[PDB]
């Protein structure tokens, strides 16, 4: 097995060494600038609260695994997990409602939990002043990790298995050759490596600069305080660090708590964000590192803590008879989206990161990475953890600083899934942006792009819209970042003609004599067809899991345009093209460009699409002139355009691509031509609803690498007859009909109760799935939701979806819900 | 017809990312190559009441006054004494990339381009008789990637064919691709003696002489936008050409615009631009020299490294 | 219905002379008496990163948060510590004139 160096002996790096060893990779050296007995990173000060429930399925699985692993990690009969359970309390109605949504996550992810009344909260946690408690969420399997003890036991058993640990060793650079890592520099020389994994916690950006990699984490300080002995607690717990009560979250006041014997530990996010310059920390001599003197602990700032102390005394009056004993401002890592940073760097083959990871998720992250290193894939979907998920504007130090500090300020807030940041905004805009503002676009952002969700100009259409198209009132939650205007935009798309801004769709140009060869190997399609063909196709991993679903348009012999899913795809293609180029001939070279930012696209869709475009083009747009799923170059309003005939909304028309400088003209030309046909601009809310009526899958929610194409109902997109492609061998024998889990379309029976995503789905009172995508279907006039379900459940069966604690009846329905004969699309 | 007379149609075919902001500032647009180019900005009329009389030109006759305005004098004034933002987006922009890129450019141009990345070089393209086909800038952005500021689509086609020929007849290490990226990117010329004062408000990068020397390039972040900054100025003042992707352009513009308010920043158009560059003696290919002239006749000897092997 | 809920139509019946400038500043408009009235300006979102934490209000519940925004806190902040321009155009304005006016 390859030579591995791990940088960092925190809870992450030692768990990784361990997970690798159990997989038979023990040629490992772990380095840490601190002493092995107390390395002095964040792991050396964490209080160790482990709350498993999380809106993210992957984070929740990492947490469940960490709990299981720490419970089994034992010496002298004492494990590294004290399973006292966990309790989140609500002091506002808003929080009470949110706990019901969290109870849904728990059921969805297989975590047992209960909602408690105020009385039950008092029975479980008598120190609570019940006067402001409205309810609690109790998860009996949560508890306290002994993180620093776990590190020692992990070092012990991996050492026994051959792993080498070198403490008091500072990494100062990374050695490389030919675009691949070769070693790790220290003052005493170079340590050779075939693989380096940076598990350096909040030092991660500093390690990244060593190879020119941007690591989007910000070191931030967070206050942690221990009280003096609390009189009410006298005699109750083992000294000095015993605990018997569930760990306690008070998210309304940004606080959490645990016992330390008869003292309390208080964690506060109820202070200003406190960025830390790691370069000013100073080099700690290993022999000087102790409990109150380590790089991760900065001086306590009492002034910042006073409001938290007042709120603490209100929640837990017994603590008012104690005082603050010791505090510190403890450093750890935040990221722009709260997700960790895992995977292979873009800059250097063989260099990996596993950084910005809570103790809560540590073992799960280590397991995923060990699967990635040893098999080439993680058994858990890393779509929201991969370092390559970020767009270029999202990796600047300024964006990382601003958004991570906002993540810290909002860490415990109740937030709607569509809630945008208010800053930074307007980073990336399409060429149509001025016209969109004229039309009163409501913009939300993703990947740095400003995306209209609907247009206030279209409000004027609701007075004319048939009542059959008007949806019922929404509740306050599902109504946030939604508008009845979306119904009018769906209406016009289905009955007239609409212009959607598809500019933000990731757009990759793969060119060169080795382009076809590259794509033939990576995708599930036979792409060797004369230019002009558009093909919907998947990218699999070696296990057959779905890495991505994309379109490939062959624009010429050696040039293909891909509609991809984001920067994970971009980095995937970049590395694969580089590898093919390096090891191939003069006829295998291939270049990959992300052209999204330099180009634009209008989705011109609806039954009057031909009537409109024929006013501004002399090209032939009839079925004879351009068949479904074909592309050709045309001129529209004087602008050279690549037109592709397909429609994620299920209507007649084309995606119209051109260079950014031409975009506004193309837009204006179409806009003017469309006036007699009642053309409108249509935003993402209508777009998402329409595509769900079509049953089209969205990568990252509807399927991920945890699913094969047959489970996801995407068998049609896999040409099993191909001679070769990544994942083919893994798929041999598989069919949709024999799949144990299948992605199903649900419609909500009451016509009214809209769900949003992640809600657990029940069949015969058992949790058997969860909502992946959902929207109100304006054409079918009811809410729609998709969920994997046991292959046993059939079309026509009834299921319940739990939404804020209420069961909503839904029916498994055949898809597409709209135009299954494709009469709107084809011909 | 006057030499500047524009068509009234077709117009607005190609516009830079700053186009909405330019209209807000009452840009007077003329077109070339399909691009709408501000010649000056009516917003700057307000500056003439404040301008020193030494900067006010005499009346123009009717002919030389067509497609001209006294506003250009105020824009020249502010460029020379404050800080101005010019739209350089229409400058032909070619990316020459691949392992055979340096080899291609070494043969076609009159410069030694084999220098560590970051160098910007003003250089000529000659024909076999020594006549001047073009005058361009070459910025070496990385080992195998160069950005060229070219003179138009005659250059583009010249490079396209030459790259194809080299690729066809060369090895696995001679291949080279040429892309015209003008339409996908943008550029602001940020020039004048207060240029550093302005940009340092919106960037943590080092823009002092130590951080970026004359005729060098490096990547920076300005107003949150990744930018390639090149230190040179066809108007003869301190500051940089700031390049970025089209989708980022408006943000970069707005960031700079806001930073520049206390320094009296203005948008400046092509009339001032042409006058300032003539005060600098900088040549314009196609009028000041063509293939009928050699570099020495045109006063461009300095740009020809006669010591090159080939 | 929330007490601030606006109609979506008819709208823009009466607008002040500053209306173009207000749209430039991303005004969120509600109507009363036919007049379009900014309730706050999205341009001012940019000020929240600079605002002292003492001025930042706690989260609102869903109901009291409808037709409200944290941006209002920044606008109050600047009015109390700097200078603000409010559009008072919709204030009913009557001219009473003639020799019997004072009487
Ligand atoms: C006050 C506080 C309270 C917290 N509470 C909780 C909680 O209740 N629950 C929870 O799940 N998490 C909690 N955390 C978070 C947590 O502790 C971290 O997320 C976690 O410990 C990170 O582990 P790590 O192994 O990635 O990094 P670290 O433990 O920081 O270890 C990584 C390191 O690499 C070494 N290193 C860095 N650079 C170099 C170099 N150049 N050469 C050699 N070695 C190097 C360091 O010396 C160090 O040991 C808390 C954190 C703080 C600060
Ligand atoms: N450019 C383009 N590329 C893209 C998308 C897009 O919006 N347009 N969106 C993403 C992927 N998605 C889809 C999903 C379904 C279809 C589609 O059209 N499916 C039809 C036809 C499939 C074909 O016969 O293989 C079928 O009925 O399922 C097109 C893109 C990313 N790639
Ligand atoms: N990117 C960039 N590329 C370009 C132009 C530009 O506007 N910016 N304009 C065109 C060519 N022109 C010039 C002419 C002179 C200079 C210049 O700066 N000359 C100084 C320095 C020359 C150097 O020492 O070699 C000297 O005093 O003559 C830069 C571009 C097309 N290429
Ligand atoms: Mg907070």
Residue A160 burial by Cβ neighbours in a 10 Å radius (0-12, 13-18, 19+):
exposed
Q: Taking a C-beta distance cutoff of 8 angstroms, is the pair A120, A130 a contact?
A: no
Q: Which residues contact A825 (CB under 8 A, 6 or more apart)?
A: A628, A647, A650, A651, A652, A819
What residues have CB less than 8 Å from A418, skipping those under 6 apart?
A: A444, A480, A481
Residue A174 burial (10 A CB sphere; 0-12, 13-18, 19+)? buried
Peptide bond into B194 cis (omega under 30): no
For ligand 2, the distance from its centroid to the CA atom of residue A225, given in whole angstroms, is: 54
CB-based contact B99:B144 (threshold 8 Å): yes
Taking the centre of ligand 4 as the mean of its atom positions, its distance from the CA of residue A405, in whole angstroms, is 10
Beta strands in A269-393 (DSSP E): 297-298, 324-334, 341-344, 351-355
Best of C10, C20, C31, C61 to disrupt the A interface (most A CBs within 10 Å) is C61
Which residue spans of chain B are classified as CATH 3.30.1360.120?
5-90+181-292
d(CA B225, CA A429): 12
CATH class of A737-814: mainly beta
Q: Are B186 and B17 in contact (CB under 8 A)?
A: yes
Are A78 and A240 a contacting pair, CB within 8 Å? no
Fold of the CATH domain A1-82+142-216+336-418: FAD/NAD(P)-binding domain (3.50.50)
How far is Cα A240 from Cα C68, in angstroms, rounded to an integer? Answer: 49
The rounded Å distance from CA A733 to ligand 4 centre is 52
Chain A residues within 8 A of B14 when measuring between CB atoms: 661-662, 665
Per CATH, the architecture of A83-141+217-335 is what? 2-Layer Sandwich (3.30)
Say which of A429, A584, A638 has its CB closest to residue B247. A429
Q: Do A463 and C9 touch (CB under 8 A)?
A: yes
Task: Give CA–CA dist A776/A454, Å, rounded.
Answer: 15
Question: Which run of H or of E encompasses A741?
Answer: strand A741-748
* Check whether domain B91-180+293-310 has CATH 3.40.50.40, yes or no: no
Q: Residue holding tokens 């779509």?
A: A383
Tokens 């409200």 belong to C68
Chain CA centroid to CA A300, Å: 34
Cβ neighbour number for residue C99 with a 10 Å cutoff: 6
Cis omega before residue A240 (within 30°)?
yes
Tokens 């036979």: give the residue.
Answer: A526
Name the residue in chain B with its Cα closest to that of A437.
Answer: B20
- Quickly list H helices, A11-92: 11-21, 57-72
Element housing B124 (H / E): strand B120-126
Tell me where in chain A the CATH 3.50.50.60 domain(s) lie. 1-82+142-216+336-418
Total Cβ atoms within 10 A of residue A447: 18
Distance A57 CA to ligand 1 centre (A): 23
Q: Using an 8 Å Cβ cutoff, are A508 and A592 in contact?
A: yes
The alpha-carbon radius of gyration of chain B (Å, integer) is: 20
Nearest to B181 among A586, A596, A598 (CB): A598
What is the C-alpha to C-alpha distance for residues B176 and B96, in angstroms, rounded to an integer?
Answer: 7
| Residue B198 preceded by cis peptide, ω within 30 | no
Instruction: Say how far apart CA B212 and CA B118 lie, in whole Å.
Output: 10
Residues of chain A with CATH 2.40.30.110: 737-814
Which technique? X-ray
Listed in sequence order, the residues at least 6 apart from A38 whose beta carbon sits closer than 8 Å to its beta carbon are A44, A148, A289, A290, A291, A294
Tell me if A140 sits within 8 A of A43, measured CB to CB: no
List, in order, residues 6 or more apart from B269 with CB less than 8 Å away: B27, B28, B37, B38, B39, B40, B41, B72, B75, B86
Q: Chain B residue with minimal CA distance to A666?
A: B13
Put simply, the answer to whether B221 touches A596 (Cβ < 8 Å) is no
Residue whose token pair is 């307000």: B46
Among A94, A272, A459, beta carbon nearest to C8? A459
Taking contacts as CB-CB distances below 8 angstroms, the residues of chain A near C11 are: 459
Residue labelled with tokens 């309304």: A252
Which are the contacts of A594, defined by CB distance < 8 A and separation ≥ 6?
A: A506, A507, A508, A567, A570
First to last CA, chain B: 46
Count the residues in chain C. 103
Pocket mutation for ligand 2, best pick of A501, A506, A648, A687 (most atoms within 8 Å of C-beta)? A648
Neighboring chain A residues of B219 at a CB cutoff of 8 Å? none
Domain with CATH 3.30.70.1400 in chain B: 91-180+293-310
Q: Which residue carries 């995306």 as its tokens?
A: A451
Asked if C61 and A422 come within 8 Å (Cβ–Cβ), the reply is no
Tokens representing A454 are 């609907």
Return all residues near B46 (Cβ < 8 A) that are at least 6 apart.
none
Please name the residues in contact with A776: beta carbons below 8 A apart, sequence gap of 6 or more: A471, A689, A754, A782, A783, A784
What are the backbone dihedrals phi and psi of residue B277, each rounded to the nearest 5 degrees, phi first? -75, -25
Q: Which residue of B has its CA nearest to A503?
A: B247
Inspect the interface and report whether the beta carbons of B183 and A661 lie closer than 8 Å: yes
Could you tell me the two tokens for A546? 């779905």
Judged by DSSP in three states, C60 sits in: coil
**CATH number for the domain whose boundaries are B5-90+181-292:** 3.30.1360.120
For residue C61, list chain A residues with Cβ-Cβ distance below 8 A.
92-94
3-class SS shares of chain B: helix, strand, coil, % to 5 = 30, 25, 45
State how far the Cα of A353 lies from the Cα of A351, in Å rounded to an integer: 7
Beta carbon of B17 within 6 Å of any ligand 3 atom: no
Block residue for tokens 């159990």: A22
Q: Which string of DSSP letters, residue by residue, matches B51-92? A: S-GGGPPPPPPTTTTTT--THHHHHHHHHHHS-EEEE-TTS-
Q: Give the CA dihedral A86, A90, A91, A92, nearest 10 degrees.
A: 160
Residues in contact with ligand 2 (CB, 6 Å cut-off) = A 505, 536, 549-551, 563, 565, 629, 644, 646, 648, 655, 696, 717
Structure tokens, A613: 């475009």
Residue with the two structure tokens 């009811």: A782
Give the CATH superfamily of A505-594+707-736. Aminomethyltransferase beta-barrel domains (3.30.70.1400)
Ligand 1 mutation pick, A43, A81, A275, max ligand atoms within 8 A of CB? A43
Q: Which chains form contacts with chain C, at 3 or more CB pairs under 8 Å?
A: A
Contacts of A295 (CB under 8 A, 6+ apart): A34, A40, A41, A281, A282, A284, A289, A331
**Nearest-CA residue for atom 22 of ligand 2:** A536
Interface test with C, best of A98, A422, A426 (most C CBs within 10 A): A422
**Cα-Cα-Cα-Cα dihedral of A607, A608, A609, A614, to 10°?**
140
The CATH superfamily label for domain A419-504+595-706 reads Probable tRNA modification gtpase trme; domain 1 (3.30.1360.120)
In the block, tokens 């009015």 appear at C79
Where in A447-568 does DSSP place strands (E)?
Answer: 449-455, 498-501, 507-511, 534-540, 546-556, 559-563
Q: Cβ neighbours of residue A45 under 8 Å, at least 6 residues apart?
A: A224, A294, A296, A297, A328, A330
DSSP-assigned beta bridge partners for residue A551: A536, A563
Q: How many CA atoms lie within 13 A of B237 on its CB side?
A: 23
Q: DSSP for A663-676, please give it.
A: HHHHHHHHHHHHGG
If one residue of A146, A149, A201, A326 were mutated to test the ligand 1 pocket, choosing by the most ligand atoms within 8 A of its CB, it would be: A201
In this structure, the residues whose C-beta lies within 6 A of any atom of ligand 1 are A 7-13, 31-34, 39-43, 45-50, 170-171, 199-203, 222, 224, 267, 330-332, 357-360
The CATH 3.30.9.10 domain(s) of chain A lie at 83-141+217-335
């Amino acid at each position: 097995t390859p030579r591995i160096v791990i940088i960092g002996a925190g809870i992450v790096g030692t768990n990784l060494a361990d997970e690798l060893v159990t997989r038979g990779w023990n040629n490992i050296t772990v380095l840490d600038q601190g002493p092995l007995n107390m390395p002095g990173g964040s792991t050396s000060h964490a209080p160790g609260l482990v709350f498993q429930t999380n809106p993210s399925k992957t984070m929740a699985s990492f947490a469940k695994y960490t709990v299981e692993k720490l419970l089994s990690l034992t010496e002298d009969g004492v494990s590294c997990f004290n399973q006292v359970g966990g309790l989140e309390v609500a002091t506002t109605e808003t929080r009470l409602a949110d706990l019901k949504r969290k109870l849904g996550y728990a059921a969805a992810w297989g975590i047992e939990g209960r909602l408690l009344s105020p009385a039950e909260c008092q029975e479980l946690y008598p120190l609570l002043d019940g006067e402001n408690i409205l309810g609690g969420l109790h998860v009996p399997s949560d508890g306290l990790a002994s993180a620093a003890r776990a590190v020692q036991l992990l070092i012990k058993r991996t050492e026994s298995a051959g792993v080498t640990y070198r403490g008091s060793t500072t990494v100062t650079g990374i050695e490389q050759s030919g675009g691949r890592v070769t070693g790790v520099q220290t003052a005493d020389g170079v340590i050779p490596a075939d693989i380096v994994v940076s598990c350096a916690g909040f030092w991660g950006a500093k390690i990244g600069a060593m190879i020119g990699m941007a690591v989007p984490l910000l070191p931030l300080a967070h206050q942690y305080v221990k009280t003096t002995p609390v009189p009410a607690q006298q005699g109750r717990n083992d000294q000095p660090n015993g605990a018997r009560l569930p760990i306690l979250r008070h998210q309304d006041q940004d606080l959490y708590y645990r016992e330390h014997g008869d003292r309390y530990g208080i964690g506060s996010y109820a202070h200003r964000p406190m960025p830390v310059d790691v370069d000013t920390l100073g080099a700690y001599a290993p022999e000087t590192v102790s409990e109150h003197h380590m790089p991760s602990r900065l001086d306590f700032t009492l002034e910042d803590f006073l409001p938290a102390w007042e709120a603490t005394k209100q929640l837990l009056p017994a603590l008012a008879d104690s005082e603050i004993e010791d505090g510190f401002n403890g450093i750890f890592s935040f990221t722009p989206d709260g997700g960790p940073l895992l995977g292979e760097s873009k800059e250097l083959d063989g260099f990996y990161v596993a950084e910005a990871v809570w103790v809560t998720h540590s073992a799960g992250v280590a397991k995923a990475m060990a699967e990635l290193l040893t098999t080439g894939r993680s058994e858990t979907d890393l779509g929201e953890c991969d370092i390559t998920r970020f767009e270029d504007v999202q990796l600047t130090p300024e964006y990382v600083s601003e958004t991570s500090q906002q993540n810290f300020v909002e860490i415990y807030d109740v937030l709607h899934p569509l809630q945008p940041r208010l800053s930074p905004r307007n980073l990336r805009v399409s060429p149509f942006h001025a016209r969109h503002k004229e039309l009163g676009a409501f913009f939300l952002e993703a990947g740095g792009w400003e995306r209209p969700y609907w247009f206030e100009a279209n409000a004027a259409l609701l007075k004319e819209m048939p009542a059959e198209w008007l949806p019922p009132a929404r509740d306050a939650w599902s109504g946030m970042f939604s508008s009845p205007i979306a119904a009018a935009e769906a209406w016009k798309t289905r009955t007239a003609v609409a212009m959607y801004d598809m500019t933000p769709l990731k757009r990759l140009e793969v060119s060169g004599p080795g382009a076809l060869k590259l794509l033939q190997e990576l995708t599930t399609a036979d792409l060797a067809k004369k230019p002009g063909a558009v093909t919907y196709t998947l990218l699999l991993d070696h296990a057959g899991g779905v890495r991505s679903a994309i379109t490939v348009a062959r624009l010429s012999e050696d040039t293909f345009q891909l509609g991809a899913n984001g920067n994970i795809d971009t980095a995937y293609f970049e590395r694969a093209a580089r590898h093919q180029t390096q090891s191939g001939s003069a006829t295998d070279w291939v270049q990959v460009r992300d052209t999204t930012g330099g180009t634009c696209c209008i989705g011109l869709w609806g039954p009057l699409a031909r009537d409109l475009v024929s006013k501004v083009s002399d090209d032939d747009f009839t079925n004879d002139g351009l068949k479904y799923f074909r592309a050709k170059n045309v001129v529209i309003g004087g602008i050279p355009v690549t037109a592709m005939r397909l429609s994620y909304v299920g209507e007649l028309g084309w995606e119209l691509y051109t260079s950014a400088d031409n975009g506004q003209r193309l837009w204006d030309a179409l806009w003017q031509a469309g006036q007699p046909f009642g053309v409108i601009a249509a935003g993402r809310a209508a777009f998402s609803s329409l595509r769900l009526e079509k049953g089209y899958r969205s990568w990252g929610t509807d399927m991920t690498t945890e699913h094969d194409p047959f489970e996801a109902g995407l068998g049609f997109a896999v040409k099993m007859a191909k001679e070769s492609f990544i994942g083919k061998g893994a798929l041999e024998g598989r069919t949709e009909e024999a799949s144990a889990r299948r992605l199903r379309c649900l419609t909500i029976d009451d016509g009214r109760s809209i769900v949003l995503g992640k809600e657990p789905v029940f069949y015969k009172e058992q949790a058997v799935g969860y909502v992946t995508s959902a929207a109100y279907g304006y054409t079918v006039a009811k809410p729609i939701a998709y969920s994997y379900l046991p292959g046993t459940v059939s079309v026509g069966d009834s299921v319940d979806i739990e939404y804020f604690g209420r069961r909503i009846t839904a029916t498994v329905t055949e898809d597409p819900l709209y135009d299954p004969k494709m009469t709107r699309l084809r011909g």
